[PDB]
Structures are given as C-alpha cells and as structure tokens.
Design a protein around this nucleic acid. Structure first.
Ligand SMILES: [Mg+2]
Ligand SMILES: [Mg+2]
Ligand SMILES: [Mg+2]
Ligand SMILES: [Mg+2]
Ligand SMILES: [Mg+2]
Ligand SMILES: [Mg+2]
Ligand SMILES: [Mg+2]
Ligand SMILES: [Mg+2]
Ligand SMILES: [Mg+2]
Ligand SMILES: [Mg+2]
Ligand SMILES: [Mg+2]
Ligand SMILES: [Mg+2]
Ligand SMILES: [Mg+2]
Ligand SMILES: [Mg+2]
Ligand SMILES: [Mg+2]
Ligand SMILES: [Mg+2]
Ligand SMILES: [Mg+2]
Ligand SMILES: [Mg+2]
Ligand SMILES: [Mg+2]
Ligand SMILES: [Mg+2]
Ligand SMILES: [Mg+2]
Ligand SMILES: [Mg+2]
Ligand SMILES: [Mg+2]
Ligand SMILES: [Mg+2]
Ligand SMILES: [Mg+2]
Ligand SMILES: [Mg+2]
Ligand SMILES: [Mg+2]
Ligand SMILES: [Mg+2]
Ligand SMILES: [Mg+2]
Ligand SMILES: [Mg+2]
Ligand SMILES: [Mg+2]
Ligand SMILES: [Mg+2]
Ligand SMILES: [Mg+2]
Ligand SMILES: [Mg+2]
Ligand SMILES: [Mg+2]
Ligand SMILES: [Mg+2]
Ligand SMILES: [Mg+2]
Ligand SMILES: [Mg+2]
Ligand SMILES: [Mg+2]
Ligand SMILES: [Mg+2]
Ligand SMILES: [Mg+2]
Lengths: 185, 148, 156, 127
RNA sequence: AAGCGUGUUACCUAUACUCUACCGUCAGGGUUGAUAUGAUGCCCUGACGAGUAGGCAGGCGUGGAGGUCAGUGACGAAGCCUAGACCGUAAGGUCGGGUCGAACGGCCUCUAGUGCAGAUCUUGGUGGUAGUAGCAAAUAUUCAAAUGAGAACUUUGAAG
RNA sequence: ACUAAUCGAACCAUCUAGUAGCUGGUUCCUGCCGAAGUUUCCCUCAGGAUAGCAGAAGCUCGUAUCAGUUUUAUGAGGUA
RNA sequence: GACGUAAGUCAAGGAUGCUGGCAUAAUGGUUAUAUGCCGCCCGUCUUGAAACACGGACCAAGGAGUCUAACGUCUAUGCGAGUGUUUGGGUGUAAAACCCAUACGCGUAAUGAAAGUGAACGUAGGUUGGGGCCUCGCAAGAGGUGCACAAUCGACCGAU
RNA sequence: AAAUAUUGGCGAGAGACCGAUAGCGAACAAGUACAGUGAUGGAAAGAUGAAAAGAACUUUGAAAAGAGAGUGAAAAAGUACGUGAAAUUGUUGAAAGGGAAGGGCAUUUGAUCAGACAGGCCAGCAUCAGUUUUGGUGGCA
C-alpha cells in the first residue's frame, strides 16, 4: 500500500496528435515531429504543438495583424509563421512585401499578399528554407474573442453575457437588472 | 449513429447511468419553466437576471421595416468599390473625378465613423451619416450627399 | 477470403544469441572424497553396495571398482552426490588408472577388454584389502539402515 | 516447424464461467460481469469464482500461438494459402468449415507442396 | 495449567513489505541519407494498479446498406447437437464429428426496432406436488340368457 | 339499499400511451479515474434548484506559484 | 570494471556446459469423482440483506433512454468578413447526381424604455509579466522585439 | 380556373421497413370462430415432397395399429408431414450419494484428447548470476 500524494495514472491533459484525420496535416505533423526531435530549436517544438490544436485554439490571423507585427523594430524581414488560417482584411490599405507561412490562406488574403509582392508559403516550405526556424515570427489570433467566451463565468456582478436567443425589451432587462424593478444583479 | 451512444455502453448496467437512489422519474422538479420564482429561483436569478417583471413602452403593430437602417463603417466604405476598380482610384487620388459610393444601393442606411480611410476624395451618398463619419470624409477631401 | 490478412508479418529471421559469460571451471569435490576411500552407493543397480573410490573423472563422475571378486561391482562411474564418503580408506598407490576416461565408458554381452582391465586392477586392490582384517567381509556386505538409525546423527 | 519460442504460459487455463450458470439453465455460461449491490462475486469474497482481469493477459511474445508455435490463419481457397508461402514458420493454415471436400483436397495438395502446416488436415476426408 | 501477573527467546502466517517475471495504464524518451520498406510502427526507462453511484476510453456480438475478397456452397449454405480440439483476460471467434437441405461469410465503412435473469413482465410450452386430493347428498341392487373382441353399466326375462 | 355476479354514482367506446415528487424493472466485455448524504433557497422535510465532492476535454507555460508540515519573529482567544 | 608486462582471459549491462530416460497418453489439457481447507440466494430499496423484507417453479421467444423542433459546451470539416445550392428554377441515365438568379437567415455595432445617438489624442495607448524570434557570447547569461493570454491604469461609443 | 389538402375510393410505381409472438386485429373459409341482453369485445391458425409417386401386396390383431414389402434423392420427409432448440420425460451406458445439491484452490484416480525424432517430453550433475535462509570459523574496537 502506498499513500498516493497525486492521482495515479493521470494523463498529461495535452494533445499529442491532431484529432483530425487530415492525411496532409498528419504528415505535416510527421515532418515537424522529426524536426523537434533532431533539432534543438524551440521553434520546432512550438510549431509541432500548435499543429495539434483544435479549431477554436487556432483563431484566424488577419493580414492586418501580420502587417502590424512587421511594424515592430527589426521584424520587417522576418518570416511570419501562422499555424492556422490567414484571412483577408480590407480595413488595412497598405501591405508590405513579406513571406507568410501558414496552413491555409483565404483567396482574398493570398491575393493581397501576392499583389503586395510577397509570397504565400506552406509549412513544409518553411521547413526547407528555415529548418531551425531562422528569423521567423509566430503569430496567433485572438482566442478570447469568440462568442462563447462572452457567456463564460456567468454570475452575479460578473459582467458576462447571458445565454439568450432573442434580444430586446422584454428579454431579461427587468427585475435583477435595474434598481427600479426589485434589485440590480 | 445510435451505435456510438452511451445507451449501448449502459447495456448490462441496471440504472442506465441514472443512479439507484435518484431513480430517474418523470418530472421531479416540474415541467418546463415551473418554479422559476419558487424552487428554481436561485438558478433563474443567477443565470437569467431580469427575466421577471416589465420594462418600458409597448409598441402596438411594430413593423421592423420602419427601423431598417443597416450600418456601414468607414473602414468598410471602400469595399463598395469593385476590387479591380478600387486601386485605380487610390492611385491618382485627385479632385474633379472622385468615386461615387451609393451605400443605399449596396444595402445600407447609416454610415458611422470607425475611420482611417485613405486621404482620397470620395462622393458618398447615404440616407444617414454620423457626425464623425462626415468629419473624416470631408477631411479626406470628399463630400456627403443625402438621398432618400 | 475467410480471414482478410495480417497487414505486416513477423520477420522469419531467427536472431543470434548474445555472448554468454559462463565459463566451465573444474569441480571441487567434498573433503571426504580422497582417492582410496570406501563409498556407499545410494542409488542405481548397486544400491547399498560398498565400493572403492579410485579416480575422479573428467565429467565430474567418480570412478569406482568395489572389487568384482569381492562384491561383484565392475569399473564404472558414479555421481559424487549419490554416494556416501565413509572414513575408511584403502591405499590406491598400487594401481594404474589413467587408462579409464569418458570414451572408455562411451556407449557406441560384456566385452573382453573390460574383463581384463577389471582383472588387473582388482588383484592389486584385494592385495591391499587383505592387510587390515575384515575389509573383504565389510565390502561384501551391503549397506542398509536399521530401525532407529539416524543418519543426521550417524557418521560413516 | 516454427521459430523457437519461450514456453507457453497461459496464466489461467480454466474457463471463466458466469456465476450461477451451473444453477439455472436460463443463465448461459458466457461470462457476464456481476453488477449486483450485494454480490459476493462482485465483492470478491474468498471461496468464490475468479473474474477476468487484465493481469491474466498473455505474454505478447507467446500471445495467439498454438502449442505447435504457429498462429492460425483461416484459409478459404488455394489463393488464400499462398499468402503464407514465405511465412510457414509463423502462420499455419486452417481450412474454413464451409469449404467443400473436393476443394479441401486441392488446398491440402498445394499446402504439402509449399510446406505450410495445416491445423485440420482430416476435415471432410473420405475413409 | 492448556488459569492469572510478569520477563526472555524460538516459531506459525495476510491480497501487507523486499526481489523477479508477465499483463495493462500513465509518464519521460530513442528511432529517416533502406527508419534493413508498417512512425496510430518498432524500441528503451521509471512508476503505478481497491471500488458502489457515476464519467470516459478501447473492443466483442445482432438485423439491414455501399464497396471489395472475380469470397463459401447441393462434392452440401444456414440452422441445431456435441463432459471433442484450438485462440482471446473477457465480450466471443475458429475447427473436428453427427443431423440438415439452399442459401451465407471475411475486411473497410453506413445504419438501427442492435445484446436480458428478474419487471406478482407478455405470449406459448412444460414440471414437482402426483397416479396424489379426490370421483361419499337424492334408501338398491341381484341372477340367468342374448349380443358383442370386450358387459357392474346394452337388451330381454326373473327377483327386490 | 337495488339499478344483468358491477353501486357512497352501472356498463361500453373514445379523449388516453390521461398524470404520478411514489413502487418495480432497465439487456455485452475489459481498461482508467472516481463520489455524496453537507451549504443556501423553495407550500420545502420521500422532491428540486444552488455551491461543494467527480469525470472528460483540454489550454498557457516548464520547476515556478506553492504546501491539511515544522522553525523563527509577531499577534489574537477567555476554554481546561 | 577486474586479472595479466602484453597477448588475452573473467564470476564485469540477466544460464550455460555435460549426461540420461521416453518419444507417448509419459508430461500436459478436458471431464467425472475422491480428499484437505474455504464457499449463505441472486436481483433490489436501504445506514445496514443469507435474512423471519420484496420479485423469482422451469424453459423458449418478445421486452425498456428512441425520434423530432429549438438550443449550450466540445470536436471534425468546408469556406472565411463573409457564409448557407436543394422555397424555387434549369437539367437528368429521374425521389439520386449536376448547375443557378433574386432574396432571405445569421455574422461584420452597440446602446437606451424611447425619441435617438453611435466606437483612433497616441506606432489602436502606458505599465508589469509573457512563448517564440534577433544580436552579443563555447555556454551560463545580457540586451532588443515581444503575438496569444493575465492583472491594472487610461482613451473612444451609447445611457445617466 | 391553377398553384393547395387528401391515414377514404380506384389504378399504378417504389423501400437501407417487418418477416408468421414480427408486420394491419386479420399472409390462412378474419372483423371469422367465440363472449356479452346490449352497446361492444374479438382470437388461434403459413411451409410433406420436383411430382402423391399419399405406402399395392404378405403377416399379427376385434379394430386402431404394428412388423415386413414398396414409393421416393431422402420416410433422420407418412398429411400428428421443411429444419426441429430448451424446459420436461423414457430407455441404455458411466459415475457419485450417513439430514440438501451446486462452487473455488490443489492433487489423486478413472475416462478422453492435441502435438513431435528431419529438437518434442521428463529429469540428474557441475560452474555461475539474482534473491534469500541456516551454520562453522578468523581478525579487530
Ligand atoms: Mg458500475
Ligand atoms: Mg433502479
Ligand atoms: Mg482458456
Ligand atoms: Mg472463459
Ligand atoms: Mg452493500
Ligand atoms: Mg503467563
Ligand atoms: Mg480499478
Ligand atoms: Mg452444414
Ligand atoms: Mg428444398
Ligand atoms: Mg429492443
Ligand atoms: Mg428470459
Ligand atoms: Mg439484472
Ligand atoms: Mg413470472
Ligand atoms: Mg385416492
Ligand atoms: Mg345415493
Ligand atoms: Mg355515474
Ligand atoms: Mg409510458
Ligand atoms: Mg483509485
Ligand atoms: Mg412559497
Ligand atoms: Mg423510497
Ligand atoms: Mg474534479
Ligand atoms: Mg470563563
Ligand atoms: Mg464563551
Ligand atoms: Mg485428470
Ligand atoms: Mg466453512
Ligand atoms: Mg429499514
Ligand atoms: Mg441481497
Ligand atoms: Mg412482508
Ligand atoms: Mg416492498
Ligand atoms: Mg414468491
Ligand atoms: Mg430474447
Ligand atoms: Mg400477427
Ligand atoms: Mg350467458
Ligand atoms: Mg412448421
Ligand atoms: Mg435429408
Ligand atoms: Mg426431412
Ligand atoms: Mg418435421
Ligand atoms: Mg432437452
Ligand atoms: Mg435420511
Ligand atoms: Mg468439491
Ligand atoms: Mg548462487
């Protein structure tokens, strides 16, 4: 008998493979598993873990977010690496010539990057031109901007969105929401 | 696919995942939204504040078409120009020949002022505009025409 | 097909053995097993027979000839663990024993070389046996445990 | 024969019979887990039947091996049989039960040529 | 004392402790210029393993559906019986023999009216009890002949 | 009391698979983790909601934040 | 690692060498029986069941978390500031498959009871952390840039 | 008038539907047999064989029927008819049995059964390695 300090046979709680059955993603994982094992660069380990992520854990990264990242000092010639989708953004009006490595490009995003003079690149092409992740820049999209995150942690005096279908007057704007009607939250 | 459900996994187990003490019954707490003020009051006050009670004016015979006024922001204003024809206006950003952007045709009622349009004069036709939207448009060198 | 297929088959190549660190060293017999002692055979066809210990052989077996004229046991081998080494001794510095070895007793009606090799050794052996009285009678008689005999408290 | 293998250890050679299958005819001998609240078999009282546990699992070296030392491969025709041509040391052919007698002699003739051991060479054999 | 109080040893034995093997789980790792073609693979190292209610995972089985094995079969399909054999920890799978007579399987997927020991469960069938309890109200039957395979019980005669 | 073996409201069919916080049952295997009977509210006390206990999915990082523990220093308490 | 001047040897990252008998019911499996010890009848409600608590005489077959409208979390997929062909039309080898316009739904804007108004002072802000990347170092480390996210102080929009 | 409805009627075409305790109550002389005064309630019940070729004839018996013979691919298909499970029963054979029987671990005994001579089965000894148990004896503090 052992007085177990911790719970026995506890899984790590981290994805060790993509949940998907995408064959091209699996052999993308196969490449970077080899790279993260046989190379000491922390870039390969980060990218391999990001390949495992679920759809809400890889939010889309807009070209405007990429352009703002390139505005940083000394980052103008770095290779922007996005483990996910790069979407277009018409809000921005000037885009620089750069190399963006991503899983997916939308039609508008890929057109805009090419029109600026840049180049859209797959993660295997990143591996051939940067095996240890030389001068890269790993970007991530806004994870907590989802609709579901609004309702997370709902409670009194929390300021979170209630789960509700129809919105307006007669829809949860009454007793419990204003001091005139009973109390306020 | 009923073969992937837990009902197939509960075969051989007496209570089918419902407990021996709880003893899954018809309606132990009521039907529907019963007891929201009496015995579901804590749940209702925690997750649905404002459910009970009345709020302001009634509107007899409301027609949602009266309140039709879709909003277009300034950062999306230039999207109303076709993409091939857009860049040829950014270059030669000149007066006496400026793009007309009829937002009513595109399906918008009011223009707001998110801002940072390029400094290009554009003629903007809309039912309604905001104060800041017109300030930014006229600063860029364009003008707003009101239509109906 | 009745069964579909095993997708990948085991390699039929048999793997070689690893190098073994076990070296054959000579056996150290018991202190009581000095050549010329009189042994009591515990098992086999010659159960309870008194014999003479002549020579330790190469396959860890003792060579015995409890004289064939005395108790009818020829030259043969016994296991050292299946004998009782008694304290009574006879002198074996009158007998040639190098002729006997593993291939002497290799398998492949009594032969003639066995009979004559028995004759040469046992004339020497009984000549030494006749010195101290009653060994000839002692070797002739078989060994047996009596009621109330305790081999834990018995010495041989 | 087969590849030399470690000695076959079964860890339980007795069938795991269902509790009280010997007591009622309606209770089939196929193993069922006792899920009763007061079940002595479920509570593992001394003097009762043993339950299937993962500890009884077979050594992966000797798993799925017959005392001959081969794995049984079920074979339906001659074409199935050649799939064990280069695996005669590891797999042994077993003619399926619905194969006719006149096809069985063809399979056995081919198996003798290829050296493939047959688990049931005397099935449907006229004599 | 084989009782009581106290002390000293030796001994007995738990699914407990130590060591080792095997199963599984978890964890950390190794492995691509034939990894001597399987990278959810192969391998190394360490620890761990109780369980109702309950949760999750990996698998076994059933009816039907798409594809494939140019699968099996009247030289015998399916079904059924078998203190006959083998494989799996197990759900089960496979084979041999007997009966039988016309269809039915493996694998990858799809689907569900998909797995029973219970519900004083439904329908049907069958036991022990058991050749047992019983076939006892209404006063009552008997003889002979005939008939017929067969008469306490039918017909006739006689008697009551 | 009787009203077709039915009467403190006949029988037949339908609404109707009426409702039940109550009783009974709820059908394959193995592996891993693993409870609560307590808080607050309720025409509530054989029941629910709620917080707690549990599983699962994980996510961000990589030996920190920590700890049903002691020491040192400094408080607090009104029981034996 | 040890011994040996070396050569090499060894008990040093897990058993080898020699010998015998049998080659079949001999070992072993299955089954029946005997013997030693152990073993209360399952399901169920319950704090507690072998209960003098309840259901169960036996067997076969049937037999109980399904489908739908709307929806929460999570996951997979397609496209992505858009997205959804299948109400319809075209077409067809005809309930399949293929193709399509205008709309419409949800999303890209919120807020107020409402009339209404409606989101950049700034490198879309400052500070503290922050993976990754860059530079200098064999490296430890130092500096620069720091997406996601966490805390906080600000700025902007609606109501008061 | 058309675009719309249609568990009725008639005529069609279909099914990832059910397969005789299922599917309509009814696959069949089924809204039948049967029950109730009545309104109403309402079953059970498919399959020999390709073809009756449905067993001529002999014998025992009062007969049913048996035993033969014969038809048939099959009578282990005889209309009490495809296959023909279990409960329960008869016969035969084996085994055990002082107020239950059944079970688990281990072995005896009986019965039965599988593979392997190009190493399979069971052992003995020696030298080692790992874990132990039991002694003898030596030198020191
Ligand atoms: Mg359970
Ligand atoms: Mg229950
Ligand atoms: Mg077994
Ligand atoms: Mg079993
Ligand atoms: Mg209990
Ligand atoms: Mg005492
Ligand atoms: Mg467990
Ligand atoms: Mg058959
Ligand atoms: Mg037929
Ligand atoms: Mg069912
Ligand atoms: Mg049943
Ligand atoms: Mg049950
Ligand atoms: Mg019953
Ligand atoms: Mg009687
Ligand atoms: Mg009378
Ligand atoms: Mg009435
Ligand atoms: Mg119901
Ligand atoms: Mg546990
Ligand atoms: Mg109240
Ligand atoms: Mg109760
Ligand atoms: Mg938890
Ligand atoms: Mg006091
Ligand atoms: Mg006090
Ligand atoms: Mg036996
Ligand atoms: Mg007992
Ligand atoms: Mg009680
Ligand atoms: Mg009980
Ligand atoms: Mg009672
Ligand atoms: Mg009760
Ligand atoms: Mg009863
Ligand atoms: Mg059933
Ligand atoms: Mg029917
Ligand atoms: Mg009547
Ligand atoms: Mg029939
Ligand atoms: Mg037949
Ligand atoms: Mg027949
Ligand atoms: Mg029949
Ligand atoms: Mg039977
Ligand atoms: Mg008696
Ligand atoms: Mg017994
Ligand atoms: Mg040793």
């Amino acid at each position: 008998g052992i007085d177990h300090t911790s719970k026995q046979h506890k899984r790590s709680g981290h994805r060790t493979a993509p949940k998907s059955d995408n064959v091209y993603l699996k052999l993308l994982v196969k490449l970077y598993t080899f790279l993260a094992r046989r190379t000491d660069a922390p870039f390969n380990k980060v990218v391999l873990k990001a390949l495992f992520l679920s759809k809400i854990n890889r939010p889309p990264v807009s070209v405007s977010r990429i352009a703002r990242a390139l505005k940083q000092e000394g980052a103008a010639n770095k290779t922007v690496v996005v483990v996910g989708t790069v979407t277009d953004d018409a809000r921005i009006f000037e885009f620089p010539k750069t190399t963006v490595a991503a899983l997916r490009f939308t039609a508008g995003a890929r057109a805009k990057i090419v029109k600026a003079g840049g180049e859209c690149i797959t993660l295997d092409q990143l591996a051939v031109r940067a095996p240890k992740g030389q001068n890269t820049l790993i970007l991530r999209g806004p994870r907590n901007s989802r609709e579901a995150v609004r309702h997370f942690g709902m409670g009194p005096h929390k300021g979170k969105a209630p789960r509700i279908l129809s919105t307006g007057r007669k829809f949860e704007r009454a007793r419990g929401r204003r001091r005139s009607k009973g109390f306020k939250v | 696919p009923s073969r992937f459900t837990k009902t197939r996994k509960h075969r051989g187990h007496v209570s089918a995942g419902k407990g021996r003490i709880g003893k899954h019954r018809k309606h132990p707490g009521g039907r529907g939204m019963a007891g929201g003020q009496h015995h579901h009051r804590i749940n209702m006050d925690k997750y649905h504040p404002g459910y009970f009670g009345k709020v302001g004016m009634r509107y007899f015979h409301k027609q949602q078409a009266h309140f039709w006024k879709p909003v277009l922001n300034l950062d999306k204003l230039w999207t109303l120009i076709p993409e091939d024809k857009r860049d040829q206006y950014l270059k030669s950003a000149s007066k006496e020949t400026a793009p007309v952007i009829d937002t009513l045709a595109a399906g918008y009622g009011k223009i707001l002022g998110k801002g940072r349009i390029p400094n290009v004069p554009v003629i903007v036709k809309a039912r309604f505009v905001s104060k800041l939207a017109e300030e930014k448009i006229r600063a860029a060198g364009g003008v707003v025409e009101l239509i109906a | 097909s009745a069964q579909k297929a095993p997708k990948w088959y085991p390699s039929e190549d048999v793997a070689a053995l690893k190098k073994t660190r076990k070296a054959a060293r000579p056996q150290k017999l018991r202190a009581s097993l000095v050549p010329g002692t009189v042994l009591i055979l515990l098992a086999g066809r010659f159960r309870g027979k008194r014999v003479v210990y002549l020579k330790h052989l190469e396959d860890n077996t003792l060579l015995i000839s409890g004289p064939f004229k005395v108790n009818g046991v020829p030259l043969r081998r016994v296991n050292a663990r299946y004998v009782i080494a008694t304290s009574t001794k006879v002198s074996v510095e009158g007998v040639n024993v190098e002729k006997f070895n593993v291939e002497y007793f290799a398998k492949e009606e009594i032969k003639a070389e066995r009979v004559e090799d028995q004759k040469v050794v046992d004339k020497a052996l009984i000549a030494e046996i006749k010195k101290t009285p009653l060994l000839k009678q002692y070797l002739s008689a078989s060994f047996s445990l009596k009621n109330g005999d305790k081999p834990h408290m018995l010495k041989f | 024969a087969s590849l030399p293998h470690p000695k076959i250890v079964k860890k339980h050679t007795k069938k795991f019979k269902r509790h009280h299958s010997d007591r009622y005819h309606r209770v089939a001998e196929n193993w069922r887990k006792q899920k009763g609240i007061d079940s002595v078999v479920r509570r593992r009282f001394r003097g009762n039947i043993s339950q299937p546990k993962i500890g009884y699992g077979s050594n992966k070296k000797t798993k799925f091996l017959s005392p001959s030392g081969h794995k049984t491969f079920l074979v339906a025709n001659v074409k199935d049989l050649e799939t064990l041509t280069m695996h005669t040391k590891t797999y042994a052919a077993e003619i399926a039960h619905n194969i006719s007698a006149k096809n069985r002699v063809v399979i056995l003739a081919r198996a003798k040529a290829l050296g493939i051991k047959v688990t049931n060479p005397k099935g449907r054999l006229a004599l």
